[PDB]
């Protein structure tokens, strides 16, 4: 499926006319009708529940639909345009030639937030197919260009091939400090452990009382291990007997409920400790949701992993 330029020019004329029709159907101004409005109108008029979005109805600009095709590589006389045409990889080798030439001129003259683009991204800047070893050679040559005393002209060039590897901050989000009718400051948070869900209210000041579904914590959790989990957050920050807690938990078993309450109290407690203490709680595993949940049983075997006995042969 090759697409000529006269074909794309016709597709763009149809999209502009169809864009004014769609704005007319929805009763909106055709002038201020954006692509976001198009996607919203198409989702309403042609509702599709298919799980794969690439298989749903779409009405986009042709430039965003058809694949970028390389233009003619020679004229009417048959002479190729580029002097590296007969290598079959003119774009790649034209880039290696330019980078190699800059490394020479330098000799005659003389990390955290960025990454090298992947091979599939380089194959789009060049519009050519590359080998794995072709990609390594080009990266090894760019790294050799950074170690040199590259100037401004040699720095804008290298940045063309560096992609931003945005690192999301692991800093815990602090809950707001609210006030009740009596003016007592408190914080609220939630936690989940297996099928148990908890919601804790940690007061800024207290005597160490904990109420679980309106029951004293040692009466609700008669097992000592469960009470040790409620002690972990407050003891790790040296705050036993300094806060009152009222939590509600439902679902799961006794140990899962103690785990959900531990996470809920730890999150709410972060509002009354210093930033450095919050980072210590995070590195102690007190602010992470445990993703370990029961695995389904599969057909043809005894359990989630347990297989039926391989019959004696």
């Amino acid at each position: 499926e090759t697409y000529t330029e006269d074909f794309i020019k016709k597709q763009i004329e149809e999209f502009n006319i169809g864009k004014r029709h769609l704005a007319n159907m929805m009763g909106e101004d055709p002038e201020t009708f954006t692509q976001e409005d198009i996607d919203r109108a198409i989702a309403y008029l042609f509702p599709s529940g298919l799980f794969e979005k690439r298989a749903r109805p779409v009405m986009k600009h042709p430039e965003q639909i058809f694949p970028r095709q390389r233009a003619i590589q020679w004229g009417e006389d048959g002479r190729p345009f580029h002097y590296l045409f007969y290598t079959g990889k003119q774009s790649y080798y034209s880039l290696m030639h330019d980078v190699y030439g800059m490394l020479l001129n330098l000799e005659k003259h003389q990390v955290i937030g960025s990454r090298w683009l992947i091979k599939e991204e380089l194959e789009e800047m060049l519009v050519e197919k590359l080998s794995d070893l072709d990609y390594m050679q080009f990266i090894r040559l760019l790294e050799k260009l950074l170690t040199s005393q590259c100037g401004a002209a040699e720095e804008e060039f290298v940045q063309r091939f560096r992609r931003s590897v945005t690192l999301e901050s692991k800093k815990q989000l602090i809950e707001p400090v609210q006030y009740d009718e009596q003016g007592m400051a408190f914080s609220k948070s939630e936690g989940k452990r297996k099928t148990a869900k908890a919601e804790a209210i940690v007061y800024k000041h207290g005597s160490g009382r904990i109420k679980v579904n309106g029951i004293d914590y040692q009466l609700y959790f008669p097992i000592t291990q469960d009470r040790e989990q409620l002690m972990f957050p407050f003891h790790f920050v040296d705050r036993l007997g300094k806060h009152d807690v009222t939590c509600t938990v439902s679902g799961g078993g006794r140990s899962a409920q103690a785990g959900a309450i531990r996470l809920a109290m730890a999150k709410a407690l972060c509002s009354f400790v210093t930033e450095d203490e919050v980072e210590w709680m995070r590195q102690a595993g007190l602010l992470t949701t445990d993703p370990r949940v029961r695995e389904r049983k599969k057909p043809g075997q005894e359990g989630a992993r347990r297989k039926f006995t391989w019959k004696k042969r």
Partner: protein
């Protein structure tokens, strides 16, 4: 010569036409009548989603071309003459309970098929608060023992569910009959009640 198909009539449509006239009622997607370059289909490698002509995936969709925001607003303007006004005095739920202490629940089921029948539609549920009934101390005590679990002390609501008759109007008349015999028997005092 073979029959040559005419060009699609979307080429004759103006961009400022009255679209509701093209799709007045629910109808399947017609490529020759929808002037949109819409595509659908998981594309092949270095391909594009299939065009609308002969596109079965666009035919499977229950489209809403007959329910554009412009059409809905014109439809509702013509349906206002059929509506009646809710009484202004009934502003809150507590005020409705005061004047209308009985609530009747019924359900209608809309399915696809040749038969409109559904046995679940006969069920009737009647709710009423004993505070709304003229019951003295003795009657309210006797009424609660007669109905059993049909009464909820927390809400003070008596729920009578009837579904032993074929029709819903019969189950409704029976629910009102039950409420009537329960009310008059609660006020009646037998001699064996003295042995409580």
């Amino acid at each position: 010569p073979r029959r040559k198909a005419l060009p699609p009539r979307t080429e004759k449509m103006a961009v400022d036409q009255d679209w509701p006239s093209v799709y007045p009622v629910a109808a399947p997607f017609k490529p020759s009548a929808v002037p949109l370059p819409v595509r659908m289909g998981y594309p092949v490698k270095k391909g594009v989603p299939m065009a609308k002509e002969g596109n079965l995936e666009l035919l499977k969709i229950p489209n809403f071309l007959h329910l554009t925001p412009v059409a809905i607003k014109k439809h509702c303007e013509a349906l206002k003459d059929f509506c009646t006004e809710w009484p202004a005095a009934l502003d809150s739920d507590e005020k409705c309970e005061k004047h209308f202490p009985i609530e009747i629940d019924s359900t209608d089921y809309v399915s696809s098929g040749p038969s409109v029948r559904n046995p679940r539609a006969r069920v009737v549920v009647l709710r009423v608060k004993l505070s709304s009934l003229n019951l003295d101390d003795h009657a309210k005590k006797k009424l609660i023992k007669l109905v059993g679990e049909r009464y909820c002390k927390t809400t003070d609501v008596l729920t009578i569910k009837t579904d032993r008759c074929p029709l819903r109007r019969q189950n409704y008349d029976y629910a009102v009959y039950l409420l009537t015999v329960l009310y008059h028997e609660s006020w009646n005092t037998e001699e064996w009640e003295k042995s409580k």
